[PDB]
Write a protein that binds this ligand. Structure first.
Ligand SMILES: NC(=O)C1=CN([C@@H]2O[C@H](COP(=O)(O)OP(=O)(O)OC[C@H]3O[C@@H](n4cnc5c(N)ncnc54)[C@H](OP(=O)(O)O)[C@@H]3O)[C@@H](O)[C@H]2O)C=CC1
Ligand code: SF4
Ligand SMILES: [Zn+2]
Lengths: 376, 149, 330, 127, 185, 71, 158, 99
């Protein structure tokens, strides 16, 4: 018999409480993001990437800026690269915390939710101090960043890193090793590496089986090749090993954050050329050419050479890719948005096969489907 | 002259008029009247069919009522004393429609603005610029009679 | 003259500012929805709670539906509400009495006040007032007599006023089919009144709203006319009850109480209401005014203008209008 | 205002928090701004008592004290009042937004506006 | 970088279907015919030295000027040899191209998305229902000729007691600003 | 006047036009000035250089302040 | 109509408004990316349980619908169906810009230009996303709005 | 299941017949889906479907025929899943200028 659930719509074929098959209906959050991006300039299209995969905000900005710089060939300063890495790892910590605690609530554990939200509130305070708003902060731009770090941010992040090491130990002690948690997670929605490769899994969902492949090491798109962090893999891909991988990724994100704080350089925050990066307020108010370039960059945009490329980054969900096709104009001709939730939600069908309803919700929580990015 | 122009508008109103390239008519230039005639399009603009009542004031009515009263008055009078006058600006579609309507009403007194009583309009070479603007470029001696270009 | 400035539908102009007195009722929803769909602006004057016109807010574009709080006994407040009005629609009226409002006060005096204010405010182009089909000076029902007097005084004070006279209107929020269904579900039977041999011509509420919209859109052909509105075919009360029971898929059951005992049962409510200072429950079925109206048949007179003269055919009452009764099945 | 604590319970929390606090300032609307350092967590070391116990609102904080209360600035409201601009400016007004049509903001084309302006961008002949 | 298996493919792949190749730092590109796309992807997926066994995604690009307006692009990855490859073809509105669901099971939803957005139908898809847009959607939103705001909009109709769909009548029309500079070329 | 009444309907407070007409012209010794908006160049407007050969006061066209040559 | 009956009616209305204000049971309609900020509002810092707000997953037991996120043409019928099941004392809080007037996807197919077109919304919370501070401000504004409900007086004077 | 493009007019005709069969078999389900029994006239609905097929005869491309059948089957699935004398010139003239 068919059982319907109604922004997650899902129809399940059941025989004896055992899930024979599950079919999701996803379009409930379709918003025409690609069409709007085609209709808008690159800078005006950056907030669309802010909105996509909203739990991990600045990862999408990083991917979009990397694609634009690849199509544009502009050098980003070392300080901008380091602060981008720092905030990408902060974003990874935020997304992992939210995913783990929403999964725990769906399982039934309610209390770690608010502790991890206290941590997330600290991180969103970091976002709000460095940029405009707590969420959807258009901070990462092509060629660099919007603004420099406010003073004291590094010290506050160091204090947060220490207290957050304590918090991760705390959460792991409560959740890991619990008999109920183990019975909920182990041997639930297992995926072989061949199955993951066939269904196009990425990130934790792909390293859970143990393919032993990470994007930050295969194609280092930042100072990542100078940060000597660790990449955990799962012995037998299932919910428990994916959860442990997420915990280890939080720890390694803290490690990378400390390294970036320690070896952050002193310099500029964006690309040197004013044809591609807007000049400062003082420069545009004092210099004739700077005023011209500010006016042109805020009415028109930088005209990227006509080319097509696919740039992918290791978003906390997985591999987030943007396929940009240009025509030499100030607006992107085509922008395809490959999110690491579209493939995982396909994987739901075979993952939650011969399982039960609680196993289905556990698998959904483990895959961490954010519907904005799957409905891009 | 029929100089080619580009009308730039922002919404329901015309904002400016600029010249556009047409080597045969106007190379890249435009007259002051042509350039700045857009301002008159938003003043003293008729926007409703109206009938002058017995008191002499205008009352706004529907297109149905206006056309009905016009048709009744047109049928009332004999077709000999019915005259049609085309305006200074009017497209060929409107002018031919007016001519056909008045002819089918029985009147042969349709004329355009600036046309004399005895005008030999049977020859386009008679009443147009045969030399053309390019020919004016190619010309060597000009005799301007009755005109102030 | 009203001027249309749009293609139509939502987010248009239509050049009409319609003040709909009594727009929070059963017919008010449909008339306001039709007016807002036209693209016109609707001023909804509401009496009491701020959430009464809440639904009416969603059927029009931004700023098109404007709710105004007033006092029905305040001439200055009525004038302020009707300050920006272009046309006026009147639907005010209650099926029962209250210690504050009687039938005469809620219909005749309010219609007189609306007509006087519309006459004083020279900017009003149309005044559409809704009454009942059986509204006659000789009608036994006090409410019908009051509505007839109200329509007469509206014609006298403001000759440029159209009067609609719909019959009993059925719909999702009607006050006959819904109480009948509730009584049938609760007690397994419904009370027929005088063995249910009397005849009516129930009319669909969206059809009435479309009729009012057509009256508003008339090119000056119905300035001072009265339009009697009724359904396609005459339904006896018993036939309407049978249709209701068939729609709900329940077994029909009737008691057919005689008129004298029905009037005796409904009598004490009026004296109690006039005596006690606290309100009494509203009579959904056992209403003396409804009994008095049911004493005589309420159908079209075949003389006054009807749906055919107005230009829209009535909807048959089997499937389109009674589709709401499915929620009452099982 | 202490009797409001029994049916409020939130003013009760504020009064409990004003045990060891120091009154850092007061505004012209009566709001009393308190600071409390020492053994206090970061998020709860600055606050306000609105001096309107019945219907205190979150929008009653003037812009002069808004930044200090929200931890944007270390400058108290007195310095910002001293730095308040001249030759222009309006007094602080709360977010009524529902206290009356005569109080709320209305667009120039809204029917509720005291003066409603037509929008057609053309002048008819107007015989 | 990592242009190893791309060159190895061009050395070993049959030359019949390689319509054109592009060696770029933005991504190595293969453009072929729609008839041989399935065979080409089967060769790449199964060959031991070009093991692109994971399909990153399938995209569509609209080119109204060309005779075959639609361009179907396949981004693939080789984790064993750590490199990305791109294989694309050209399809028009009516012609149906081969489906690669059998090779890569993940291709089903991306192919449904391509159908939804452009109208390029696939030959061997187990199902090809719309995935992203509203139920009963009439057009293909990602086509260039498709208006940005669409053709219809929804609202609540009180007499119908349901959300109805009506032709668009939106206020504050989209303002297209022409920022293009005549000296950009 | 018409423009002020078109964008504003308060008609009770002083419009910016009246305030900017009330602020007196600024007397300067030199023939040219640097108009910045306020005491902090970074918080004002783009720098505007104004010629003062004409006898009448010259509006800055930014933060219009009517600089006038001394002699 | 008197001055003592009016006082008694005012006291009864005050009690009813106090109860309805202190026992608001909103239901999340958590689409898009105001729902994460809503969960932040429900977190430890800006806690909602203090004021009586507790999220009821069943629409039949909920008091007010808080629509946070983008409303899609594919989801608007579901929103209306869920709203219709709520009890007659009901309110709507439209959080963000998507649910107010379409927000950042206003000129887009399959996007409802604000939830006002589907359900009658009482209070809009501007922001994108509105701070949890601002959303709790909007909930307090809902409490203030339902703090002036003279239901008993209106019933008495009919 | 989607099939390759029809290579013959006879194959396109067979597919059209199969689609018409599917519509006819799925007609009574639409009866309980929509509930317009008063003025449905199932025979009239079949006649209207046949009239649509007959007004779509000007097409001769088998690819266009297959695409039309695919969209018709999609519409059938959607309907099953319940997803909804003054001459012509003078009326338009009285209505609006744009006609
Ligand atoms: N029974 C029927 O349905 C039929 C009715 N009619 C006629 O149509 C009229 C309108 O019917 P209908 O809309 O369906 O019924 P309603 O009673 O629902 O509509 C009347 C509206 O006016 C309000 N109202 C009631 N009494 C007063 C008052 N004293 N002062 C101010 N406002 C008041 C009502 O409640 P609130 O104050 O909350 O706004 C409601 O909004 C009837 O009065 C009757 O003459 C004709 C045929 C059939
Ligand atoms: S209003 Fe802004 S923050 Fe809220 S759902 Fe929309 S895009 Fe996201
Ligand atoms: Zn200046």
């Amino acid at each position: 018999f068919t059982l319907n659930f109604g922004s997650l719509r899902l129809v399940l074929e059941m025989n004896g409480e055992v899930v024979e098959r599950a079919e999701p209906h996803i379009g409930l959050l379709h918003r025409g993001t690609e069409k709007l991006i085609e209709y808008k300039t690159y800078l005006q299209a950056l907030p669309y990437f802010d909105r996509l995969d909203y739990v991990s905000t600045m990862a999408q900005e990083h991917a979009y800026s990397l694609a634009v710089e690849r199509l544009l060939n502009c050098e980003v300063p070392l300080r901008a690269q380091y602060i981008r890495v720092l905030f990408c790892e902060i974003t990874r910590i935020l997304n992992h915390l939210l995913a783990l605690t929403t999964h725990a609530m769906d399982v039934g554990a309610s209390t770690p939710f608010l502790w991890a939200f206290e941590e997330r509130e600290k991180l969103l305070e970091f976002y709000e101090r460095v940029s405009g708003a707590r969420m959807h902060a258009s901070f990462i731009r092509p060629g660099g960043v919007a603004q420099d770090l406010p003073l004291g941010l590094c010290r506050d992040i160091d204090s947060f890193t220490q207290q957050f090491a304590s918090r991760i130990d705390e959460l792991e002690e409560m959740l890991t090793g619990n008999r109920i948690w183990k019975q909920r997670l182990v041997d639930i929605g297992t995926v072989t590496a061949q199955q993951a490769k066939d269904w196009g899994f990425s990130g934790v969902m792909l390293r859970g089986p143990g393919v032993c492949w990470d994007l930050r090491r295969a194609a280092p798109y930042d100072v990542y090749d100078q940060l000597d962090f660790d990449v955990p893999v799962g012995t037998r891909g299932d919910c428990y090993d994916r959860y442990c991988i997420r915990i280890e990724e939080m720890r390694q994100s803290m490690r990378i954050i400390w390294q970036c704080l320690n070896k952050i350089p002193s310099g500029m925050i964006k690309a040197d050329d004013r044809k591609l990066c807007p000049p400062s307020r003082c420069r545009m108010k004092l210099s004739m050419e700077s005023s011209i370039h500010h006016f042109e960059l805020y009415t028109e945009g930088f005209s990227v050479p006509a080319s097509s490329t696919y740039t992918a980054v290791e978003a906390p969900k997985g591999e987030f890719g943007v396929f940009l096709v240009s025509n030499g104009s100030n607006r992107p001709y085509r922008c395809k948005i490959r999110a690491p939730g579209f493939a995982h939600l396909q994987g739901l069908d075979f993952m939650s096969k011969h399982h039960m309803l609680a196993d289905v919700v556990t698998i959904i929580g483990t895959q961490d489907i954010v519907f904005g990015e799957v409905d891009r | 002259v029929g100089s080619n122009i580009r009308i730039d508008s922002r919404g329901p109103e015309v904002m400016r008029i600029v010249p556009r390239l047409n080597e045969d008519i106007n190379e890249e230039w435009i007259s002051d009247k042509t350039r700045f005639c857009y301002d008159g399009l938003k003043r003293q603009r008729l926007n409703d069919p109206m009938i002058r009542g017995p008191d002499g004031r205008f009352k706004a009515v529907n297109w149905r009522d206006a056309l009905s009263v016009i048709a009744d008055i047109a049928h009332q009078v004999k077709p000999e004393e019915i005259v049609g006058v085309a305006g200074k600006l009017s497209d060929a579609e409107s002018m031919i429609a007016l001519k056909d309507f008045l002819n089918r009403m029985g009147s042969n007194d349709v004329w355009g603005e600036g046309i004399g009583v005895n005008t030999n309009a049977d020859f386009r070479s008679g009443y147009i610029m045969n030399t053309s603007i390019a020919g004016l470029e190619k010309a060597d001696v000009f005799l301007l009679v009755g005109t102030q270009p | 003259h009203l001027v249309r400035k749009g293609t139509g539908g939502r987010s248009s102009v239509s050049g009409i500012i319609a003040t709909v007195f009594g727009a929070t009722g059963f017919l008010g929803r449909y008339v306001v929805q039709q007016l807002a769909k036209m693209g016109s602006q609707v001023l909804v004057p509401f009496r009491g709670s701020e959430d009464c016109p809440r639904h009416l807010k969603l059927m029009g574009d931004l700023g098109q539906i404007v709710p105004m709080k007033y006092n029905p006994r305040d001439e200055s407040s009525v004038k302020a509400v009707m300050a920006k009005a272009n046309v006026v629609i009147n639907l005010i009226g209650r099926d029962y009495e209250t210690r504050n409002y009687s039938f005469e006060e809620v219909h005749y005096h309010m219609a007189e006040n609306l007509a006087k204010i519309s006459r004083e405010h020279g900017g009003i182009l149309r005044f559409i007032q809704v009454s009942c089909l059986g509204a006659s000076p000789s009608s036994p029902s006090r409410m019908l007599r009051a509505k007839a007097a109200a329509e007469e005084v509206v014609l006298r004070e403001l000759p440029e006023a159209t009067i609609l006279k719909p019959a009993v209107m059925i719909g999702t929020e009607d006050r006959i089919l819904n109480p009948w269904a509730h009584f049938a579900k609760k007690y397994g039977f419904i009370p027929l009144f005088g063995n249910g041999s009397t005849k009516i011509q129930p009319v669909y509420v969206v059809d009435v709203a479309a009729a009012l919209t057509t009256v508003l859109k008339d090119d000056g052909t119905s300035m001072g006319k009265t339009y009697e509105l009724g359904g396609p075919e005459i339904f006896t009360v018993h036939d309407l009850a049978e249709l209701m029971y068939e729609t709900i898929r329940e077994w029909p059951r009737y008691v057919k109480v005689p008129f004298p005992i029905a009037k005796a049962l409904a009598t004490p409510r009026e004296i109690l209401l006039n005596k006690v200072p606290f309100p009494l429950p509203t009579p959904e079925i056992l209403n003396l005014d409804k009994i008095q109206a049911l004493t005589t048949d309420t159908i079209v007179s075949e003389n006054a203008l009807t749906f055919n003269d107005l230009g829209i055919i009535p909807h048959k009452l089997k499937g389109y209008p009674v589709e709401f009764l499915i929620s009452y099945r099982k | 205002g202490y009797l409001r604590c029994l049916p409020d319970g939130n003013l009760l929390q504020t009064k409990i928090h004003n045990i060891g606090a120091t009154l850092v300032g007061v505004d012209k609307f009566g709001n009393k701004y308190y600071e409390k350092l020492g053994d206090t967590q970061y998020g709860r070391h600055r606050w306000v008592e609105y001096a309107e116990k019945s219907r205190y609102n979150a929008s009653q904080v003037p812009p002069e004290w808004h930044g200090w209360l929200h931890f944007i600035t270390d400058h108290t409201g007195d310095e910002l009042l001293l730095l308040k601009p001249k030759r222009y400016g309006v007094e602080h007004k709360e977010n009524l937004s529902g206290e009356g049509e005569q109080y709320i903001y209305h667009s120039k084309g809204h029917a509720l506006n005291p003066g409603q302006r037509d929008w057609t961008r053309y002048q008819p002949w107007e015989s | 970088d990592n242009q190893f298996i791309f060159k190895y493919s061009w050395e070993t792949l049959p030359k019949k279907w390689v319509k054109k190749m592009e060696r770029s730092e933005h991504g190595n590109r293969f453009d072929t015919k729609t008839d041989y796309l399935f065979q080409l992807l089967c060769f790449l997926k199964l060959h031991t030295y070009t093991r692109v066994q994971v399909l990153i995604d399938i995209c569509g690009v609209d080119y109204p000027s060309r005779k075959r307006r639609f361009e179907v692009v396949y981004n693939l990855l080789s984790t064993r040899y750590n490199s990305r490859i791109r294989v694309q073809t050209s399809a028009d509105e009516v012609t149906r191209i081969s489906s690669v669901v059998s090779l890569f099971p993940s291709a089903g939803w991306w192919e449904r998305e391509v159908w939804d957005m452009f109208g390029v139908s696939f030959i061997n898809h187990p199902d090809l229902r719309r995935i992203l847009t509203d139920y009963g959607f009439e057009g293909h939103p990602l086509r260039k000729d498709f208006p940005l705001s669409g053709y219809v909009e929804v609202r609540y109709d009180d007499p119908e007691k349901r959300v109805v769909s009506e032709p668009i009548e939106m206020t504050q029309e989209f303002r297209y600003f022409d920022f293009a500079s005549p000296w950009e070329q | 006047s018409n423009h002020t009444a078109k964008w504003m309907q308060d008609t009770s407070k002083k419009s910016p036009m009246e305030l900017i007409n009330e602020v007196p012209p600024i007397k300067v010794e030199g023939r040219i000035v640097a108009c910045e908006g306020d005491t902090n160049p970074a918080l004002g407007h783009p720098i505007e250089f104004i010629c003062l050969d004409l006898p009448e006061p010259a509006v800055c066209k930014y933060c219009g302040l009517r600089y006038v040559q001394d002699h | 109509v008197s001055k003592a009956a009016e006082f008694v009616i005012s006291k009864v209305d005050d009690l009813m408004n106090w109860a309805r204000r202190g026992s608001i049971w909103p239901m999340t309609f958590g689409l898009a990316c105001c729902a994460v900020e809503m969960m932040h509002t429900g977190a430890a810092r800006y806690d909602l349980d203090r004021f009586g707000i507790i999220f009821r997953p069943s629409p039949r037991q909920s008091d007010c619908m808080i629509v946070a996120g983008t409303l899609t043409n594919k989801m608007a019928p579901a929103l209306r169906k869920v709203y219709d099941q709520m009890p007659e004392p009901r309110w709507v809080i439209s959080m963000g810009s998507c649910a107010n007037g379409g927000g950042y996807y206003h000129y887009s197919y399959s996007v409802v230009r604000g939830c006002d077109r589907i359900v009658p919304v009482d209070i809009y919370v501007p922001g994108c996303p509105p701070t949890a501070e601002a959303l709790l401000y909007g909930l307090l504004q809902l409490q203030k709005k339902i703090n002036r409900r003279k239901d008993f007086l209106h019933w008495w004077t009919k | 299941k989607v099939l390759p493009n029809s290579a013959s007019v006879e194959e396109a005709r067979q597919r059209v017949f199969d689609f018409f069969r599917a519509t006819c078999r799925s007609l009574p389900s639409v009866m309980e889906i929509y509930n317009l029994y008063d003025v449905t006239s199932v025979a009239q609905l079949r006649s209207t479907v046949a009239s649509e097929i007959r007004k779509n005869i000007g097409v001769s491309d088998p690819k266009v025929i297959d695409m039309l059948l695919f969209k018709g089957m999609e519409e059938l699935m959607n309907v099953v899943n319940h997803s909804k004398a003054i001459s012509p010139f003078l009326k338009n003239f009285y209505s609006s200028n744009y006609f």
